[PDB]
Design a protein around this ligand. Structure first.
Ligand SMILES: c1cc(-c2ccc3c(c2)OCO3)n[nH]1
Ligand SMILES: [Zn+2]
Ligand SMILES: [Zn+2]
Ligand SMILES: [Zn+2]
Ligand SMILES: [Zn+2]
Lengths: 69, 68
């Protein structure tokens, strides 16, 4: 039905929000510290000196184990 | 249709996976450091000396700003 199409769209958008903002291909699994923005995969987070969202200095990257992984 | 029910169940499970594993009421927004398990809201994470997934000591809690 049309309701099935609406639910498919909600699921697709939620899943796309879980992907890295830089490569758009891998799941997010890294946090920039101390700001806390958790928007990248490990590879993309590895070479950034400043947060791509807020511009804060990245002191280190924390790996995150999320249930949605 | 039956697919509407199947999709509603998939959405419900994905939403429940984003909720705190302890209180089941608030969204996950905190990481236990250094282990990295990100399974609690800030109120439950503040009250745990040990990670509820791996039992490692919690040195500190990092707030996470997630896209959703
Ligand atoms: C990559 C990103 C996520 C994610 C994103 C938002 C969330 C969340 C998990 O649980 C609470 O709200 N999972 N894998
Ligand atoms: Zn990436
Ligand atoms: Zn940031
Ligand atoms: Zn909680
Ligand atoms: Zn842990």
């Amino acid at each position: 039905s049309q309701q099935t199409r609406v639910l498919q769209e909600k699921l697709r958008k939620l899943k796309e929000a879980m992907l890295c903002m830089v490569c758009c291909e891998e799941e997010i699994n890294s946090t920039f510290c101390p700001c806390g923005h958790t928007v990248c995969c490990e590879s993309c987070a590895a070479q950034l000196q400043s947060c791509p969202v807020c511009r804060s200095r990245v002191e280190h990257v924390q790996h995150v184990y999320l249930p949605t992984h």
